[PDB]
Amino acid sequence: RRPVSNGNFQQRVKAGDIVVAPYTSDGKITVKLVAGQKDISSTPDYDY
Amino acid sequence: STAAVTGQTGLTITYPASATESAAIQGTFGNSAAIKIKNQTLTWTRTPEGAWSCATTVEAKFKPAGCAS
């Protein structure tokens, strides 16, 4: 995160100041790599 | 008669002409055969390496165990 400590926020509120802050929440990034079941051959054949 | 031409219409011979092609003997059911298995074909194929195997287009319950796919 990048939380910005804004000093006496209440004081500047009394001053009537609009306030912004470059902020980040606790984000996350996940990568899953998933192997693939891939057919290649067959021979014993049966019907039912 | 001969591999190129035989004495029966339902018999076809695939005679190889090169070292990289296979040989096949195919017979077609008919005449005195069952009406259900009429026009079906059973073939004996030979790889150029020298291995023989059998295959057929008849139903599975009519397929012999030695010719099962």
Automatic annotation (TrEMBL), chain A:
Coiled coil: none
Domain of life: Viruses
Localisation: Virion
Family designation: Belongs to the Leviviricetes maturation protein family.
Protein name per Swiss-Prot or TrEMBL: Maturation protein
Span covered, complete protein: 99 to 146 of 534
UniProtKB/TrEMBL annotation, chain B:
Top-level division of the source organism's lineage: Bacteria
Disulphide bond pairs: C54-C67
Family the entry assigns: Belongs to the N-Me-Phe pilin family.
Assembly: The pili are polar flexible filaments of about 5.4 nanometers diameter and 2.5 micrometers average length; they consist of only a single polypeptide chain arranged in a helical configuration of five subunits per turn in the assembled pilus.
Protein name (Swiss-Prot/TrEMBL): Fimbrial protein
Organism: Acinetobacter higginsii
Part of the intact protein present: 79 to 147 of 150
